[PDB]
Amino acid sequence: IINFDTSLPTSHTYLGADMEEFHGRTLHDDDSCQVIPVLPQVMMILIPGQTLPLQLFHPQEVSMVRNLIQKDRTFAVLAYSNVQEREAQFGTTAEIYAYREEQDFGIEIVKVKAIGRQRFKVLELRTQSDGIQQAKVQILPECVLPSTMSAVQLESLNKCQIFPSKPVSYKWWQKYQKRKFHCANLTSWPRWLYSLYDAETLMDRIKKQLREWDENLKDDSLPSNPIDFSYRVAACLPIDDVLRIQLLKIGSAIQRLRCELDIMNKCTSLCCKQCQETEITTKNEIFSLSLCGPMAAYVNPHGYVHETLTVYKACNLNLIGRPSTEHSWFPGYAWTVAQCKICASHIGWKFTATKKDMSPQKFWGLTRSALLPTIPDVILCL
Amino acid sequence: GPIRLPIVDKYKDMGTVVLGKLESGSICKGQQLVMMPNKHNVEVLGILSDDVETDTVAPGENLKIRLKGIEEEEILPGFILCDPNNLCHSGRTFDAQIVIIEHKSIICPGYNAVLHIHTCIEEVEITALICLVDKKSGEKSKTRPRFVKQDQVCIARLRTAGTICLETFKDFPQMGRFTLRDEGKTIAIGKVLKLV
Amino acid sequence: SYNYVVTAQKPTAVNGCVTGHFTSAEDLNLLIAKNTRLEIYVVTALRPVKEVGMYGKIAVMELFRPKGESKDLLFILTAKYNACILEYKQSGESIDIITRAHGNVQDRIGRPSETGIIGIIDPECRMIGLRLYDGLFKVIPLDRDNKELKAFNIRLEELHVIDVKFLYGCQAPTICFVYQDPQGRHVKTYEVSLREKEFNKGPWKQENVEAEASMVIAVPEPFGGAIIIGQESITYHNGDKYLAIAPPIIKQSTIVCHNRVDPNGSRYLLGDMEGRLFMLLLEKEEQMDGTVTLKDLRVELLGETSIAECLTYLDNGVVFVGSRLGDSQLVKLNVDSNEQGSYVVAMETFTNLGPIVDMCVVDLERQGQGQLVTCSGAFKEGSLRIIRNGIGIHEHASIDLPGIKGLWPLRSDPETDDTLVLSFVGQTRVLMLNGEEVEETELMGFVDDQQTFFCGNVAHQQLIQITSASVRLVSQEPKALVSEWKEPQAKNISVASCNSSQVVVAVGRALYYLQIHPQELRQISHTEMEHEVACLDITPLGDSNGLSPLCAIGLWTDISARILKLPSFELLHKEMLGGEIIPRSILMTTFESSHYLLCALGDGALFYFGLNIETGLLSDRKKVTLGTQPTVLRTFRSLSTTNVFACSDRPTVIYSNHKLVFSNVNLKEVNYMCPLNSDGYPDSLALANNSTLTIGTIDEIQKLHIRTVPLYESPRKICYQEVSQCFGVLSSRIEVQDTSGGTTALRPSASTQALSSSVSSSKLEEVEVHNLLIIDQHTFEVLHAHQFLQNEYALSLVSCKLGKDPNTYFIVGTAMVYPEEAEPKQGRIVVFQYSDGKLQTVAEKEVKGAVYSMVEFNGKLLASINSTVRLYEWTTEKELRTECNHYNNIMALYLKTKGDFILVGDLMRSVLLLAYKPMEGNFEEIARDFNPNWMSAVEILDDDNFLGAENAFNLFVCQKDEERQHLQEVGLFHLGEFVNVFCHGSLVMQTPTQGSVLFGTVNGMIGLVTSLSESWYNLLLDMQNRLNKVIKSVGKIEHSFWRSFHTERKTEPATGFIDGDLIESFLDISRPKMQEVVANLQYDDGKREATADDLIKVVEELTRIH
């Protein structure tokens, strides 16, 4: 139905000429203590696997990054739990994979592309005389649990736990549940309950919702490891910062996947955060225009990061001015600032195609910071 | 394609030689050209790109160029060579998008400063400024501002001392970027939008 | 918090079974592994020998014979990767198992494979192959000097390995296995270099095997090669030869276990998943002497067995069937097909409680001590088990004979008893014992028209009989009366008692003293007493060669037990008891050389004092209640010591270790008794109630007795409704998708064979049908079977009273399960009432979600619905109206409550505390603790400590004491068993321990948990570390390593717990090891050096809680 090319927005081509790329990868040992610098102006809760673009202008930020591009390329992104909370307890590491320093206009500007790697717990914060802070951090391990039947499996049925690969289906999943959870009759709960805590089943249930948004092939785009999968879905869920913090505090993918599935079903409406009482869009209009999903982080010309959820239709929004193609995050579309009709708060932008052959001809890009998920009929993460 | 060569400096040698960095298009030996501010025709003699001589050369390189034509000095830095078909726009008033980066107080219309556009350096005055624009959104301001302070972006109209060669951004980058300058400090940077 | 974990019923399921020559090369042994227990039997045409306790979960158990060893050796590998090689040693009368080699074979990194640990031993007995983790193959060389079990790994190209086996008939250590890659399932063979340490390409391979290849069987010589088992085909593989059959008789279910019958390799056994039993047969042809080529493979169905986990043929045609779902069988299989069908017949049936899905405690025998009823087994092995703590009685003969009001043994000829005298109402009879046949005889000199109060052999080769009116003395040589005694005014005798030389009878308020001389009864004294006499005793206590100098009395009105001196009747001690009920029976006996006085009351109260023979002082009194009905005290001998049998409505045997142990007797009612020792019933007991005379022997110590009530279908939940004397049980049977509407049952089960059967809807592949069963608390007959709706899953069950309604209802929470919907969208809460003989459906509540659990919460019903806890109020119009509602993050799987607290958990170890606030009609989160891990069941210990079982068979305790909402991790313990349910209660009569909690297990193990004071936990922790140095551990497994809290990712030491099994083993070591254990201890009694008897009195106080 569409033809845009979901691979374009993830590239962040609006940043210009190809950046220098790095192939190396740095991962710290679980539970190890590390001192990692914090960027003073980044206001985001970064989740592992999420791409974070930045434009740094201030010399102190630029200087710190030049040093980082030479060392491990990893900085700390503190996850602020409350608005007036001075001390940060959690956060996520970001690994620079592309960078470019340019002396164009006459001011040193640094463009960076980072990716979330490891979650950590903040142990100490020390501010240097320059304004760049260092975090004494403890790498939080990813808790991997075995199959729920591992401690309740019969040794005679061990040779039956391996199943031959599935055909690319309704009848097959019924046989999967019956065979993997056969030894559930030795416990207090039935097979269908254990299914509710099975990574593979939960992941197949999420894919069914992701397929409603994108014609992406499950085969490749989505990772097969539940850990990576669980983090990838969390990145494109249009939830508020308090909920995003709760998902990051979750150490088990199982708990994360279940909590995500509940969010995907409960919160169907998206209202204006400033008003709280003004519907802007619904989950039925959410769609993915980028390989990352319906929501991804993008940077504006002044280094402001916006997690933009692409939706087909929005209401109660007034458009200010005329469309512009300048620094467009979706090349081929022009943007027009969109404010709320009631409180005039900036909600996002309307994107209108520049060429008649493009489809969709129009859509809306809403900034997560301006929206508030509402349950029809405070949302609680199951 | 179209050719643009901002002139850094000239010097009388051979017939007449000119210095610059060649930003637009390719330049062939003997390729007839023009000089935009005075509309002076001129023919190429020798293309001394780098220290070597080559008959033709592509954008990027640093060319010394021998000029055959009615050009024997009376050419200033901040002039340009131009393809005779689609040549460069000029004049002395223009609109531009100007982000204030360093200034202790407030700049308001009639603010005097220097204007560095490519090779050209000419004093400039901001006649009136049009509309603020918010950095978070992009929102063109509702009312006209009376002034703009630091760390702030606006769009304004600008009159230089006299006849210079401007080209809008989007059309051309290197000639469309500029830096306002005062007391040697860099006070603003700007992309040019319209041409009055 | 500090707690105490003790095993009350060792596991019953069978992890594995194997035969061999372990005790002696001449003997044939059968080795059974009941999880963390090892049973060693000797086969005859089974004999127990030794049972030992591993400090580990037995995962691999095989027998083998190294080069130059007298008998087979045993290899054991635990779930925590403890490896050891064990030998049997007998020094004459002391059986001991010595460890030869030991060592942990865990690798610092690795992912444990899906098919679990696989251990094998090559036929040459040179190496030991183990597939612990994926892509690797650990190998242990079996050199004589490998006492550390040093081993090495060998990389594998194949990652997904199904099953591996060492091949027979190869001069090189050759393995053969099945694997699976994205291209399909295949089979390969490798050769192992014990020196070069790698794989060399094996003999043969044949890719693209059966899709469900699961089992590999190595065939010994002369056949060689291997057999491949699957869902569809049984295939042979040796070299380029390829024999393949596909019998349709096994396509109906899956083969799970196997065993070799004859050591040549022609006959194999095949165990099914549904209990079927098959015999594989290999057809040979001996072309010449030497070569034996395989012709064909045949299979025959031999009959039905218990759902088998492990199998082993023994000898002479008998097979042991070890099961984990149902009872273990000893089966004899004949060559003649039985009349019912196939050729199998059960011989013995070994009890097996596993698995335990739920259990409840019940006071089935009115009040007193509790009993335990479990939902045990699965599928056709489904059964209820009733477990009571008490003493058994082996009935040798039962005779209907009402009115027995007295019982005495008699020796009619001087040895051993030969005559039983029975006293009826106002009359008397005599029974004679010729072998096991009882017949009425007459005893000349005895009067048979009066109520006999006592008779028995006495001194000078004489008898005696004390009727209501006389005191007759009979001779033995001619057998006739020689001297009769009566009252001077010929009045009736009230109470009497006698020993062997003295006789003290009483009339009203007066009592007389007689002596037994040849042909004479010499009256002596006749003091008057203040009030009527109730009971007296003249037992000769101790030391005195024949006669006693004391006389114990109980009096009416005064209700004072008194000790008088003979023949003066001087009041040596008066003790005034309760004051409303007269005494009914008194007795003076001695236990473990300590002298007690006992006295029972007509209301069942039992006093026991301490007696000073020379002083007559009755001191250190203690009282215990035994039953509502009057009690009668009798002395008898068992195990060369004198016990005391207390006849009543709750019969009780009193024995003993300087601590009296009142042990219930597994019998209905017993009014009168006497010890009988005849030529046909030696050293036995004679019991008598209102209608039965029972004779039989009695066990020496109380164990656990288990009554099996088969259901032939899986039970799920259970609760006890006392006001109806019935059990409510949830059950599920299996049916098959049939023609037309379908759903035809498999076999007659407990839900199809009920008295009255109901349903919830008419008719308007496998499929499960759920039922609510009503079971009588006495007969255990299925009184009613409710069948829930189609596609309805019954999850919870509770019997309680709600609101101000006096009726006690059965409440069941359900959930609709359709295969297309992952999470259940709707369920119901049904409120039944069992009135008379009907099951009225009182009320229903359609709910939009599942109902994983319920609980009665302060007269109101509290239920969980998905991630929501809902509180229901019971209307006066007989309905459920909502009062409160509370949402959570967690699926409210587990639900327990004490007082106003509520503890909510899920399968993910996540725990919530909730408190009812009546002034708000809502709930408030009190505390929480999230630490993601698999949780099987939880329970509330008290208001501040909460018990649960997490993955890898562990226990934990959380503790309460702003950020005072954090639950600390104060207790950890690797129990080694999969706990499946907790419930309060005990199995002993009504203080070192505080509280008591029982729990079930998948392996059928029943344990107990109780709290301790810090003083005891500190001491008993010192006790543990002292015993670990002393007691010899099998396989040299560190006790601290065994109980260490284990997960796949972490391994922390245990804390806040005490392995009561280890503490209880203090009484099994020899006396010097005790003194060795108490190496300068500071014991506290208001401190000094501690002795061995100091800790025995301590440990015996702990063994009396289960």
Ligand SMILES: O=C1CC[C@H](N2Cc3cc(CNC(=O)C(F)(F)c4ccc(Cl)cc4)ccc3C2=O)C(=O)N1
């Ligand atoms: O798809 C999208 C949706 C729109 C979004 N944008 C564009 C944008 C432009 C400006 C004002 N421009 C500038 O300030 C400038 F970039 F044009 C500039 C001019 C002169 C100089 Cl010297 C430097 C920079 C302010 C905010 C935004 C903003 O949030 C975006 O980035 N890509």
Ligand SMILES: [Zn+2]
């Ligand atoms: Zn608004």
